Enzyme design. Structure first.
Site, PDB file in Angstrom:
ATOM      1  N   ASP A   1      57.747 -89.092  59.475  1.00  0.00           N
ATOM      2  CA  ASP A   1      56.850 -89.716  60.449  1.00  0.00           C
ATOM      3  C   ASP A   1      56.173 -88.652  61.322  1.00  0.00           C
ATOM      4  OD1 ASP A   1      55.491 -91.779  61.891  1.00  0.00           O
ATOM      5  OD2 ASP A   1      57.287 -93.065  61.852  1.00  0.00           O
TER       6      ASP A   1
ATOM      7  N   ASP B   1       7.751-158.352  12.103  1.00  0.00           N
ATOM      8  CA  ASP B   1       9.120-158.789  11.839  1.00  0.00           C
ATOM      9  C   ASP B   1       9.584-158.363  10.446  1.00  0.00           C
ATOM     10  OD1 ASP B   1      11.588-160.005  12.230  1.00  0.00           O
ATOM     11  OD2 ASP B   1      10.765-162.006  12.623  1.00  0.00           O
TER      12      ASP B   1
ATOM     13  N   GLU C   1      51.146 -86.008  61.336  1.00  0.00           N
ATOM     14  CA  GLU C   1      49.660 -85.971  61.377  1.00  0.00           C
ATOM     15  C   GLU C   1      49.146 -84.530  61.539  1.00  0.00           C
ATOM     16  OE1 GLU C   1      50.701 -88.919  63.428  1.00  0.00           O
ATOM     17  OE2 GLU C   1      50.435 -90.196  61.670  1.00  0.00           O
TER      18      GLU C   1
ATOM     19  N   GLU D   1      13.265-154.147   8.651  1.00  0.00           N
ATOM     20  CA  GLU D   1      14.551-153.398   8.583  1.00  0.00           C
ATOM     21  C   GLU D   1      14.438-152.200   7.612  1.00  0.00           C
ATOM     22  OE1 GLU D   1      14.747-156.811   9.155  1.00  0.00           O
ATOM     23  OE2 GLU D   1      15.497-156.492  11.198  1.00  0.00           O
TER      24      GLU D   1
ATOM     25  N   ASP E   1      17.830-163.511  16.522  1.00  0.00           N
ATOM     26  CA  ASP E   1      18.134-164.901  16.209  1.00  0.00           C
ATOM     27  C   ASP E   1      19.474-165.304  16.820  1.00  0.00           C
ATOM     28  OD1 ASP E   1      15.858-164.729  14.539  1.00  0.00           O
ATOM     29  OD2 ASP E   1      17.035-164.754  12.662  1.00  0.00           O
TER      30      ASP E   1
END
Ligand SMILES: *[C@@H]1O[C@H](CO[C@@H]2O[C@@H](C)[C@@H](O)[C@@H](O)[C@@H]2O)[C@@H](O[C@@H]2O[C@H](CO)[C@@H](O)[C@H](O)[C@H]2NC(C)=O)[C@H](O)[C@H]1NC(C)=O
Ligand SMILES: *[C@@H]1O[C@H](CO)[C@@H](O[C@@H]2O[C@H](CO)[C@@H](O)[C@H](O)[C@H]2NC(C)=O)[C@H](O)[C@H]1NC(C)=O
Ligand SMILES: *[C@@H]1O[C@H](CO)[C@@H](O[C@@H]2O[C@H](CO)[C@@H](O)[C@H](O)[C@H]2NC(C)=O)[C@H](O)[C@H]1NC(C)=O
Ligand SMILES: *[C@@H]1O[C@H](CO)[C@@H](O[C@@H]2O[C@H](CO)[C@@H](O)[C@H](O)[C@H]2NC(C)=O)[C@H](O)[C@H]1NC(C)=O
Ligand SMILES: *[C@@H]1O[C@H](CO)[C@@H](O[C@@H]2O[C@H](CO)[C@@H](O)[C@H](O)[C@H]2NC(C)=O)[C@H](O)[C@H]1NC(C)=O
Ligand SMILES: *[C@@H]1O[C@H](CO)[C@@H](O[C@@H]2O[C@H](CO)[C@@H](O)[C@H](O)[C@H]2NC(C)=O)[C@H](O)[C@H]1NC(C)=O
Ligand SMILES: *[C@@H]1O[C@H](CO)[C@@H](O[C@@H]2O[C@H](CO)[C@@H](O)[C@H](O)[C@H]2NC(C)=O)[C@H](O)[C@H]1NC(C)=O
Ligand SMILES: *[C@@H]1O[C@H](CO)[C@@H](O[C@@H]2O[C@H](CO)[C@@H](O)[C@H](O)[C@H]2NC(C)=O)[C@H](O)[C@H]1NC(C)=O
Ligand SMILES: *[C@@H]1O[C@H](CO)[C@@H](O[C@@H]2O[C@H](CO)[C@@H](O)[C@H](O)[C@H]2NC(C)=O)[C@H](O)[C@H]1NC(C)=O
Ligand SMILES: *[C@@H]1O[C@H](CO)[C@@H](O)[C@H](O)[C@H]1NC(C)=O
Length: 1771
Positions: free
Chosen positions: A443, A1334, A446, A1337, A1440
């Site tokens: 520690d 008509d 520095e 189809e 129909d």
């Protein structure tokens, strides 16, 4: 100015970085002064005059090049400016460029780095970078040769090179900058807005005020773009400095000495840049396994006894605890290498006590040594050190410098001196002999003086007081440190200050080698420099117990991982201040996942160890729970440290390092990963129980449950209770686990396990590194295990890549947990291909799809293979035998399928188990995605019907932000594609930012996934078993989002919603009265589905071959077609009414019908003679029943031959003319088939043969004959004969035109033209107004062709016969042969087999064009057979029906479906068609049918008349009443048809279209809306005088009374007598209306009106569209009136958007205005502004029901003149 030529104020480089800006200083330095500008923008900036020039050329060298630079004449800034500088560049590696700028004449300080040694070699080749040096002014530029992008540019500012000031500025490609330390940035990404950071090691608290901290790190990373491309920069300089970011973007390093020594590091990803950097500076140390446990520490324990009590308390609580730290307390008089003889007596015994419980001891050591060593009281450390002369000295180089720290007056060791290292080693040895510690905490390295410089102060030198000082705290380089002129072995404190901590860590690492034998220890340090991570761990300093510090801990940790110090963390629960239970709890939760996890308290604060908060506290329980999870995962964490140590990976990682493809991850700093696999999401805010978190694009599993989460690539609100933190495992990874204990010692003897998290392709991979965990150089001496796990195709493969270590504890893998799997079964374990006797026991949770294979023992250290086979649930079973016949176990095993006789109904007996195709070559583009699909199983595919296709392509295209298309087709062969044109964008706009969806192609099994970006819901998922692409059999399935599906037709259904309980529906046009499970007239392969949150999407399959769809209760949908390709369109919504606008935009918007066609219509098969149609007309007018159209069936034609007139209807032409003179209109019926058996002239057939317009056999060239209605000439027809007998004896032979062909189109149009204007006799001309086509189809009464029969049975009875009617009679039943040939417009030949369902669609458009030509007006076509895009030119009737009670509700469902299909004009035959009508039924049906868009009463032959005048007076009154209501509303109805035509809105809407939020509306099909405003609630049952109707949430007014009914979201019983139909208007809408009449012609000449239904807020809105109602393209040519109306604040305003029809010469009169819900207060006055003319209208207000009626007929006001109407209520 010309010197001051700066493009951009953001590119200014501050010329005054020290003092405040003054024109005096700038003028002196030579920098341009410009104070105008914004904040933080520097007024002073360097001119082009400043810098260096390259005199000569770039002399080449073996490693790179060298250049000489001389200084451009300019004013000195700080003095002592070097004039001659040498540049040396070295191409060290393919990805690492190094260059250095130094003095040419003199030698300057260079960092003596222990790892980085001078480069000796030659230039690398090839290089991925290019260096270009500019000569004047000098600049260096690094370019990425791959994409020619500049990464490093030093041209933005000048090179400054003085003795005590160096500067270089670098322009960067992006602002994504990460790194630079050690400071508190409060955010990972760097704010580039004029921010400056000082770098100089200093002892201070991380306050967050932007101050220099304890370390010095100059490295930064920059992410160039979303490809991952990245680069890094590193400056090797130890002097004090500052780094300045600029919004250019630009970075600038300003230092106080040394040389400029740069490294540029390139990589393809962020992680590769980090690996490059760590390989250069030195790879991190591998920590001891025990150091990864939890650590406990406190500043002042006062006495050994207090410390012991803490140890015992936490042990008793059974909290995971392994390491105990000791602070300066033990040291007597805070002296190192000594311990208190009284307070800490027994310290050695404590160390032994810890060891006997498997715990460790870490002791603190400070660099400063005291000087108080007398013969009376000796201090050994000092005496021995003085003897060795190892102290830092005063400037004289001889006298030890004296400072003051903890012990008081102290001396400082010089760790850069080798003799110092020897002394240091010895001291540790003596103390270790007294106290048996396990690691070292260093520690105040520095360094850190309590005084400034020395006890005597510092000298007045340019080192202590330099000409330039960075923005450091205080402002003096010698504040709280040593004097800058102090002398060490490597140099002066001025140069080596930032290296003190680094040098001490090196020396300590050496000491450990001697003290602890073959035992790596643990060194924790505070001060750091580049390369420290090779020796020590680091902690982030002295935080405070606040919520800010909690938040700041995470970015701090992430930056240090970049710097190569992965073992890092902050102090949990804070070090300074007192912590609260919540803060300490929420900190313990996240702190359990720090790499270095330690609870550390300060001096004189509340004890914060977890057991302090109470034995049954929530904090302790929570802490114990998450610390146990950490211990379970230590094998995983340890392996991460292995990869950091061996290769240079990060351990705790930011999201952007893994998920860089997305830009939402480049700023996240509140969430992090452990390695690539584990996402951690904490709560960092006071009092919060929820977090906003981003979930990246991957499969994620909840760690605690194992269940998959549904979030992907989106932000979420996560619910995290006080005792929960967010933990999720990434799919695709394997995690090694070990049963936890209270210490690592006891845990490394427990059994191992695996967690296998599978991905989208059901695959995963992992690694385990294992070793003693204490010895040193295990990896270097190769004494360790390394495993590699992999899962694919339900097989796990353990595999040992290195085995030179043997574990003494006989460990085994006992459990395997698999996430995202189906139930594993028949588990087989084999070692090195040798069966291992075992009984694996599996346990599977069905909901979470999680399995646990137990009862297995995989001995650590040996190779193995575990295989399993999966079980399929009954709901996910896909029928493998859909064939009509042949279902058998023998036929399944052959196909390659599984047989199981399911007792449960619906569930298939033969199901699929394997895939036939594989996926490869997956490429994701900006506007699409593609992949190749290849047949793997040829044999099994052949067993399936038809021949298999081998090679297929998948193509995905992103057309728009809300639409996409995906297609699967054969690239090698042209297959039939539907020739129906769609409207798609020419250029794709599916930009990644704007688009509403994402696509993912998956494998094993193959599938596509489409997801909604906003909610992350998957709307299409195909990864199911069954995909087949045979020539005449194609199958594909998807997973539905919810149980709500609407669409698929035309087929009669019991409801609007579709039942998904194992139902199969065929689709192939047929002349069959709509019935349950019966293919009908139209084929519409389209559906719309609701998601569970109420979002909606739609899907179209564009295919015309015969097909079927099956609905599984998964929910799942399967499609099976007999040909073509797979072409899907998807519409993303997001609302049920925008999917229809999107759909109709793609297929084409509905046609605009003539106004008269919205009136009532009369038709009847069996009209005996003309004089009967005349009788009806007269009688209808007599009874005043309003009607507009009169139809004529085949009766008007002779022997039912087209384009002829029967003698019985000789007066027909005259009658037509008379009716038309009175405003009536006439529609005629046409059939497509043309007779070939006429004896007298028959132009149609004769000219047809000459123009070759009929369908013929492939090549034979013979006409395909059939039998429909036309009869034989010169025969007598006996009605008694059975139908079968009539077809065989009386019916004639007919030919069918090919309407795709150009010749057919010319012939057909000419015939219709001659019908309108008869060439032979103008007297026989029939002036029709529209056409009814008509039997299209096509339809025949003889299967295939006439007898003999058809020819090619291969097409007639195909390999797979879809589930249609007469499934045993084949495709040709009641139609043409499938081999008939047709010819497309471009000349290509097609088979009737492919285009059968597009026959009516092919006739529709030619017919539409010719009618508009002969009549000169819009006209109407009505078609029986329809296909997507038929509504563009024609309407449709529902066919129909029969006179029965169930047929009334079926009609409501039918009209709602055809609206979704984009056909707006539709309706049913009122009062039924078959059977005889009943008074009540025909009455109730008249009421309902008055609100169909196509409203026609039609009956069959030989049945009771159903016409309104065929009954008694009671009926005439009912009929007249309801029809007058219809005629009143036509202006509203006509405006509805306009919006549909122009915008794609719906006319007959469902309730869920307007009220999708109410889920009650999701199953209603007994009520409906016209437009948004008008609700219809009919009676659909016999003998019922009340109707139960649901009123959604709004304001509903009774149409007849105008009184509001209070029913907001409630059911209600409405009175419904025989003469009444319930109608209601929604508040907030304005309805235009007009007075009714016999026909529209008369009605359009009456007064207009406006019913106004005010909402609760008192507002209302509506539209009106008006034109002539007959002309073609009134909107396209601009002859119409269009206006929007608004009511608010007691006033109504008209906003005419367009007007070119309504004029003074052609007025539309307005006479009545009715306002509903005006309130109870009396109405004082009403005023009307008519183009600047105030008119006072007549009015009356009945406050009982609240209705204001305003009359203005006398005002003579036309609509174009109206502006506004205002009413003032009594005050
Ligand atoms: C804190 O935990 C205690 C103890 O819970 C037990 O131990 C846990 C680690 C976990 O395994 C739980 O399922 C256990 O129940 C809770 O207190 C009660 O403790 C007694 C005695 O041990 C136990 O028999 C009871 O079941 C616990 N009470 C319950 C489950 O309601 C205590 O509730 C927890 N703290 C808080 C604040 O809730
Ligand atoms: C430890 O160092 C201090 C500072 O150098 C010494 O204290 C000084 O001692 C001299 C005599 O040698 C006195 O004249 C000064 O007044 C002292 N300075 C102060 C008190 O500031 C101290 O003697 C040293 N101790 C040793 C060497 O045992
Ligand atoms: C585990 O399996 C691997 C792969 O089969 C074995 O590794 C091979 O060992 C031979 C030994 O002569 C080497 O020559 C090869 O280079 C190795 N790798 C491969 C890919 O073949 C390994 O020996 C097995 N370990 C055991 C049995 O403990
Ligand atoms: C026209 O048709 C009508 C209706 O068929 C013929 O006359 C009536 O036929 C119905 C049966 O359909 C009988 O109930 C009536 O008694 C008939 N009336 C008469 C006066 O005979 C009618 O003869 C036909 N002929 C025309 C109009 O030329
Ligand atoms: C229509 O066909 C029926 C059935 O063949 C004919 O009815 C028969 O006519 C004969 C004439 O001699 C009678 O003897 C029979 O009694 C009738 N019925 C049956 C069941 O055989 C009928 O005449 C035909 N109608 C015509 C030709 O107008
Ligand atoms: C018209 O005909 C209808 C149907 O036959 C008559 O309706 C019935 O009238 C009786 C006597 O009032 C009631 O008991 C039945 O309930 C009615 N049936 C239905 C279906 O409504 C009706 O009365 C006739 N109107 C006239 C004027 O004769
Ligand atoms: C609406 O009509 C229903 C059905 O006719 C009525 O309910 C029945 O009323 C009779 C009256 O004699 C009772 O005998 C039955 O038990 C009732 N059936 C049920 C299912 O409740 C009902 O009263 C009417 N309600 C109105 C008009 O509000
Ligand atoms: C009536 O029509 C006008 C013209 O289309 C609408 O006004 C525009 O509204 C859009 C969308 O809010 C704005 O961007 C424009 O600036 C408006 N144009 C103007 C005022 O000239 C108006 O909103 C319509 N009224 C209603 C109630 O729909
Ligand atoms: C709207 O206003 C007009 C004018 O006041 C009303 O029409 C007149 O009504 C009276 C009484 O029946 C007649 O004497 C007049 O001959 C009517 N004038 C015309 C031109 O017809 C009309 O009735 C009012 N409408 C309503 C619904 O109140
Ligand atoms: C039909 O309406 C007329 C006119 O309102 C009325 O005179 C007649 O009585 C009504 N007939 C019946 C049966 O209600």
């Amino acid at each position: 100015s010309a010197e001051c030529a700066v493009a951009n104020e953001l590119e200014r480089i501050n010329c005054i970085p020290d003092q405040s800006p003054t024109k005096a200083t700038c003028d002196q330095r030579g920098c341009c002064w410009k104070p105008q500008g914004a904040i933080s923008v520097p007024w002073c900036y360097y001119s082009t005059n400043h810098g260096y020039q390259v005199e000569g050329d770039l002399v080449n060298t073996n490693a790179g090049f060298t250049a000489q630079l001389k200084r451009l004449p300019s004013p000195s800034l700080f003095g002592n400016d070097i004039n001659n500088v040498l540049l040396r560049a070295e191409y060290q590696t393919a990805t690492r460029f190094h260059f250095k700028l130094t003095d040419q004449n003199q030698d300057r300080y260079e960092v003596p780095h222990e790892h980085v040694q001078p480069f000796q070699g030659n230039a690398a080749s090839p290089l991925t970078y290019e260096v270009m040096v500019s000569k004047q002014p000098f600049s260096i530029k690094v370019i990425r040769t791959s994409n020619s992008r500049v990464l490093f540019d030093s041209s933005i500012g000048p090179l400054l090179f003085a003795d005590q000031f160096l500067q270089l500025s670098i322009r960067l490609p992006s602002a994504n900058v990460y790194g630079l330390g050690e400071h508190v940035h409060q955010q990972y990404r760097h704010d580039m807005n004029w921010k400056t950071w000082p770098i100089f090691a200093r002892d201070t608290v991380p306050n967050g005020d932007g101050n220099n901290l304890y370390g010095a790190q100059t490295f930064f990373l920059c992410l160039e773009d979303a490809s991952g491309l990245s680069f890094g920069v590193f400056l090797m300089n130890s002097n004090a400095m500052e780094v300045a970011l600029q919004p250019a973007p630009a970075v600038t390093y300003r230092t106080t000495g040394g040389i400029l020594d740069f490294y540029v590091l390139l990589g393809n990803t962020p992680e590769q840049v980090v690996q490059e950097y760590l390989q250069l500076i030195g790879l991190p140390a591998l920590p001891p396994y025990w150091a990864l446990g939890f650590h406990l520490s406190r500043y002042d324990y006062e006495t050994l006894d207090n410390m012991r009590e803490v140890v015992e308390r936490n042990r008793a609580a059974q909290l995971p605890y392994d390491v105990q730290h000791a602070d300066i307390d033990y040291m007597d008089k805070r002296r190192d290498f000594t311990y208190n003889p009284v307070d800490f007596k027994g310290f050695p015994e404590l160390a032994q006590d810890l060891h006997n419980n498997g715990q460790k001891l870490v002791i603190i050591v400070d660099p400063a040594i005291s000087n108080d060593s007398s013969p009376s009281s000796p201090y050994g450390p000092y005496d021995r050190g003085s003897d060795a002369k190892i102290w830092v000295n005063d400037p004289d180089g001889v006298t030890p410098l004296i400072g003051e720290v903890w012990p008081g007056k102290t001396v400082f060791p010089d760790y850069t001196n080798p003799k110092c290292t020897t002394w240091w080693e010895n001291e540790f040895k003596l103390f270790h002999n007294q106290v048996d510690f396990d690691g070292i905490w260093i520690d105040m390295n520095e360094v850190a003086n309590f005084v400034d410089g020395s006890v005597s102060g510092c000298s007045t030198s340019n080192l202590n007081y330099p000409p330039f000082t960075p923005r450091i705290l205080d402002g003096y380089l010698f504040s709280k440190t040593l004097c800058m002129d102090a002398v060490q072995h490597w140099g002066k404190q001025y140069d080596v200050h930032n290296l003190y901590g680094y040098s001490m860590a090196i020396a300590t690492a050496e000491a450990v080698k001697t003290v602890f034998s073959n035992k790596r220890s643990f060194i924790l340090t505070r001060s750091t420099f580049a390369g420290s991570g090779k020796f020590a761990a680091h902690w982030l300093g002295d935080n405070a117990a606040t919520w800010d510090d909690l938040r700041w801990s995470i970015p701090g940790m992430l930056e240090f991982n970049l710097f190569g110090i992965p073992m890092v963390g902050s102090d949990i629960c804070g070090f300074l201040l007192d912590t609260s239970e919540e803060l300490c709890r929420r900190w313990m939760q996240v702190g359990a996942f720090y790499p270095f996890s330690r609870n550390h308290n300060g001096q004189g604060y509340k004890v914060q160890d977890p057991a302090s908060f109470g034995a049954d506290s929530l904090l302790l329980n929570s802490s114990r729970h998450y610390l146990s999870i950490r211990y379970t995962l230590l094998p995983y964490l340890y392996t991460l440290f292995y990869h950091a140590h061996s290769r240079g990976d990060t351990v705790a990682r930011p999201l952007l390092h893994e998920f860089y493809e997305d830009s939402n991850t480049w700023d996240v700093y509140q969430q992090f990963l452990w390695g690539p696999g584990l996402l951690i999401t904490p709560v960092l805010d006071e009092g919060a129980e929820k977090v906003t978190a981003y979930v990246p694009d991957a499969v994620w599993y909840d760690y605690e449950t194992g269940g998959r989460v549904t979030w992907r690539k989106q932000k979420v609100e996560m619910e995290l209770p006080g005792d929960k933190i967010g933990l999720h495992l990434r799919g695709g990874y394997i995690f090694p686990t070990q049963q936890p204990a209270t210490t690592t010692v006891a845990s490394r003897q427990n059994p191992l396990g695996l967690i296998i998290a599978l991905d989208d392709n059901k695959e995963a991979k992992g690694e385990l590194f294992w070793d003693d965990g204490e010895a040193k150089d295990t990896v270097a001496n190769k004494v360790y295990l390394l495993y590699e796990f992999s899962v694919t195709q339900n097989r796990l493969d353990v595999k040992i890549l290195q085995s030179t270590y043997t574990d003494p504890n006989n460990l085994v893998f006992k459990e395997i947990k698999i996430l995202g799997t189906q139930e594993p079964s028949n588990v087989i374990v084999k070692q090195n291909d040798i069966p291992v006797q075992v009984s694996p026991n599996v346990a599977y949770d069905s909901n979470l799809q999680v399995a646990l294979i137990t009862e297995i023992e995989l001995e650590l250290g040996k190779n193995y293979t575990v295989e399993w086979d999966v079980k399929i649930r009954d709901e996910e079973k896909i029928d493998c035998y859909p064939d009509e016949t042949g279902a058998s176990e023998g036929n399944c095993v052959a196909r390659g399928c599984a047989w199981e006789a399911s007792t449960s109904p619906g569930v298939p007996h033969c199901y699929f188990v394997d895939e036939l195709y594989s996926v490869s070559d997956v490429q994701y583009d900006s506007f699409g995605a593609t992949a190749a699909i290849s047949l793997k199983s040829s044999l099994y595919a052949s067993a399936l019907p038809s021949v298999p296709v081998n090679s297929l392509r998948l193509s995905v295209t992103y057309h728009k932000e809300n639409m996409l298309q995906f297609k699967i087709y054969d690239p090698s062969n042209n297959r039939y594609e539907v020739p129906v044109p769609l409207n798609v964008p020419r250029v794709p706009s599916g930009t990644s930012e704007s688009r509403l969806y994402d696509v993912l192609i998956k494998k094993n099994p193959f599938g596509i996934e489409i997801r909604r970006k906003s909610t992350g819901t998957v709307i299409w998922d195909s990864q199911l078993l069954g995909f087949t692409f045979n020539d005449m059999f194609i199958q594909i399935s998807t997973r539905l989002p919810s149980q709500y599906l609407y669409g698929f037709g035309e087929t009669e259904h019991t409801a609007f919603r579709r039942n998904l309980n194992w139902h199969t529906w065929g689709m192939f046009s047929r002349d069959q009265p709509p019935g349950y499970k019966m293919n009908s007239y139209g084929v519409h392969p389209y559906y719309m589905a609701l998601e569970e949150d109420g979002n909606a999407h739609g899907v179209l399959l564009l295919n015309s071959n015969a097909m079927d769809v099956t609905f599984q209760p998964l929910p799942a949908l399967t499609y099976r077609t007999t040909g073509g390709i797979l072409d899907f369109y998807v519409l993303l919504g997001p609302t049920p009414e925008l999917v229809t606008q999107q759909y109709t935009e793609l297929i084409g918007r509905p046609v605009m019908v003539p106004y008269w066609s919205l009136g009532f219509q009369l038709c009847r098969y069996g009209y005996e003679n003309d004089s009967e149609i005349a009788s009806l007309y007269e009688d209808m007018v007599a009874a005043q029943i309003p009607y507009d159209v009169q139809y004529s069936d085949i009766d008007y034609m002779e022997r039912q031959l087209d384009f002829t007139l029967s003698p019985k209807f000789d007066g027909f032409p005259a009658l037509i003319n008379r009716m038309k003179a009175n405003g009536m209109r006439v529609i005629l019926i046409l059939d497509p088939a043309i007779s070939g058996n006429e004896t007298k002239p028959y132009p149609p057939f004769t000219r047809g043969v000459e123009d070759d317009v009929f369908i013929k056999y492939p090549n034979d060239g013979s006409i395909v004959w059939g039998k429909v209605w036309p009869d034989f000439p010169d025969i007598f027809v006996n009605s008694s004969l059975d139908w079968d007998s009539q077809v065989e004896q009386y019916r004639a032979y007919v030919a069918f035109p090919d309407f795709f062909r150009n010749s057919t189109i010319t012939w057909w149009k000419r015939e219709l033209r001659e019908l309108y204007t008869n060439p032979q006799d103008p007297e026989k001309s029939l002036k029709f107004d529209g056409m009814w086509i008509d039997m299209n189809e096509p339809s025949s009464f003889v299967n295939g062709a006439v007898s003999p029969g058809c020819r090619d049975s291969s097409l007639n009875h195909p390999p797979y016969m879809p589930y249609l009617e007469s499934r045993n009679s084949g495709l040709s039943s009641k139609t043409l042969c499938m081999e008939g040939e047709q010819i497309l417009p471009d000349g290509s030949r097609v088979r009737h087999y492919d285009v059968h369902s597009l026959y009516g669609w092919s006739q529709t458009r030619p017919t539409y064009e010719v009618v508009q030509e002969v009549t000169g007006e819009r006209g109407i076509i009505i078609s029986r057979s329809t296909y997507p895009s038929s509504g563009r030119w024609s309407g449709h009737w529902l066919g129909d029906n029969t006179a029965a009670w169930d047929q009334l509700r079926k009609s409501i469902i039918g009209m709602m479906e055809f609206s979704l299909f984009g056909i707006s004009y539709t309706g049913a035959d009122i009062c039924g068609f078959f059977q005889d009508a009943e008074f009540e039924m025909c009455a109730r049906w008249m009421q309902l049918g008055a609100f169909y868009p196509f409203s026609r009463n039609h009956n069959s032959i030989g049945t009771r008349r159903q016409d309104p005048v065929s009954w008694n007076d009671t009926f005439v009154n009912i009929s007249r009443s309801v029809l007058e209501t219809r005629y009143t509303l036509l202006p509203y109805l006509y405006t509805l048809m306009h919006m549909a035509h122009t915008e794609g809105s719906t006319v007959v809407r469902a309730l869920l279209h307007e009220f999708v939020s109410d889920r009650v509306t999701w199953d209603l099909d007994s009520q409906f809306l016209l437009g948004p405003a008008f609700l219809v609630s009919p009676v659909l049952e016999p003998n019922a005088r009340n109707v139960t109707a649901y009123f959604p949430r709004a304001r509903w007014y009774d149409y007849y009374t105008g009184v509001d009914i209070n029913a907001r979201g409630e059911w209600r019983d409405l009175s419904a007598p025989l003469d009444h139909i319930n109608l209601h208007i929604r508040g907030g809408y304005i309805l235009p209306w007009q007075e009714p009449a016999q026909n529209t012609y008369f009605s359009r000449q009456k007064f207009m009106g406006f019913k106004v239904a005010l909402d609760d807020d008192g507002t209302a809105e509506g539209w009106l569209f008006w034109d002539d109602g007959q002309s073609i393209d009134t909107y396209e040519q601009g002859l119409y009136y269009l206006a929007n109306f608004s009511v608010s604040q007691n006033t109504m305003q008209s906003h005419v958007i367009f007007n070119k029809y309504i004029s003074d010469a052609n007025p539309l009169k307005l006479g009545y205005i009715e306002i509903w819900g005006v309130g109870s207060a009396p109405i004082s006055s009403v005023s009307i502004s008519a183009s600047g003319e105030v008119i006072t209208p007549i009015f009356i207000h009945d406050s009982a029901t609240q209705v204001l009626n305003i009359n203005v007929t006398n005002g003579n006001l036309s609509l174009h003149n109206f502006s506004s109407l205002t009413w003032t209520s009594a005050p």
